[PDB]
Design a protein around this nucleic acid. Structure first.
Ligand SMILES: [Mg+2]
Ligand SMILES: [Mg+2]
Length: 342
DNA sequence: CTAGGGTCCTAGGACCC
DNA sequence: GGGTCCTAGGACCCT
């Protein structure tokens, strides 16, 4: 009863699209991200820029210190969405059991496939080749018996490669696997785990489940399971979007309500247009606002509300401004809706 | 020197039974 | 005294 899970993941996705569409960018360091003047971060970078230490989520001023010749690009999201749609259609030639996790990646359950004589290894290779042949972009892939190991595997032979983990290979693989490599174990958790002497799955294997449950709740059960290669999460092709948000960080902090209100007047038409794409009648479950202050504390206030409404978002932002700001400057203003359930 | 798009989990009081 | 809803916050994910 062992499943075959593929995780397909595009290489340097945004940057690879830009180099395909402008070959001049192929061999110089580039990154998609907000400018230093816009107080931006790097969304991603190509390998020439990564060589300097440029990484996703790096503050753009830091990227430019490591890599002074970095070429900064704004991003063409319709181009990325187009490539995303194309690779998802390519996935569908092989199975309907597709769970996209973001624009550039997806799980595939090919357990019941008899493409490529049932070889998940050859299916992954054929998908990667097809993506290259039809989009001129490269992808990497991971093959394993459960989701999380497949996702880990797709990172290990990047770029333009793949890695297969068989059931026989799972124990040796897990023994020295850093906990931080597990999707969902981030910096904070890995630092907590590190401070109690838990660095790898092999370390967690020597732990009591009951202790982990006390110390971490349901996360502790996940940690205990994953550290044993256990991951029964099914590939789910039926997930739906639950929220829509529009937010912007300004280049300078704001200190006046008039400025906040003026920002909202610019955010609102964009929120309306994006909601209308998925809900033409604008009917929603909740709407609300977000402020981020100059000390990086952020607050949200959202409430049951039946239909996108600009004046109520302004009014709510006014309360948040007056009630929770405490005189600090504001670097970000955001609008948000929660979508109706079905 | 710190984005913007999101998902999920937690947790207290409200409300219900 | 248990479920669920309302709400806020925060870790984490992707590029
Ligand atoms: Mg990728
Ligand atoms: Mg990805």
């Amino acid at each position: 009863g062992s499943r075959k899970i593929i995780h397909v993941d595009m290489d340097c996705f945004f940057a690879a699209v830009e180099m395909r569409d402008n070959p001049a960018l192929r061999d110089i360091p580039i990154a998609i991200g907000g400018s230093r003047e816009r107080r931006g971060v790097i969304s991603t970078a190509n390998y020439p820029a990564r060589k300097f230490g440029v990484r996703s989520a790096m503050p753009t001023g830091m990227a430019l210190k490591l890599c002074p010749h970095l070429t900064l690009l704004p991003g063409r999201f319709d181009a990325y969405k187009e490539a995303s749609n194309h690779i998802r259609e390519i996935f569908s030639r092989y199975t309907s059991r597709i769970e996209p996790l973001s624009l550039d990646e997806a799980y595939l359950d090919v357990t019941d496939s008899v493409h490529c004589h049932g070889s998940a290894t050859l299916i992954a290779q054929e998908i990667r080749q097809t993506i290259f042949n039809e989009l001129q972009l490269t992808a990497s892939a991971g093959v394993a018996p459960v989701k999380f190991l497949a996702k880990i595997a797709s990172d290990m032979n990047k770029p333009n490669g793949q890695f297969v983990i068989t059931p026989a290979e799972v124990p040796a693989f897990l023994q020295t696997l850093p906990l931080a490599k597990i999707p969902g174990v981030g910096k904070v958790s890995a630092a907590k785990l590190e401070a109690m002497g838990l660095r790898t799955c092999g370390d967690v294997q020597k732990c009591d489940l009951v202790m982990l449950l006390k110390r971490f709740g349901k996360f502790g059960r996940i940690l205990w399971e994953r550290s044993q290669g256990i991951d029964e999460r099914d590939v789910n092709s039926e997930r739906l979007r639950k929220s829509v948000g529009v937010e912007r960080t300004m280049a300078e902090d704001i200190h006046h309500w008039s400025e906040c209100e003026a920002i909202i007047e610019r955010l609102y038409p964009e929120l309306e247009r994006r909601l209308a794409k998925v809900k033409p009648d604008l009917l929603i479950a909740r709407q609300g606002v977000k402020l981020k202050f100059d000390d990086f504390q952020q607050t949200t206030q959202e409430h049951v509300w039946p239909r996108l409404n600009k004046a109520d978002l302004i009014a709510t932002a006014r309360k948040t401004w007056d009630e929770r700001r405490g005189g600090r400057g504001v670097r970000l203003v955001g609008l948000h809706v929660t979508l109706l359930d079905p």
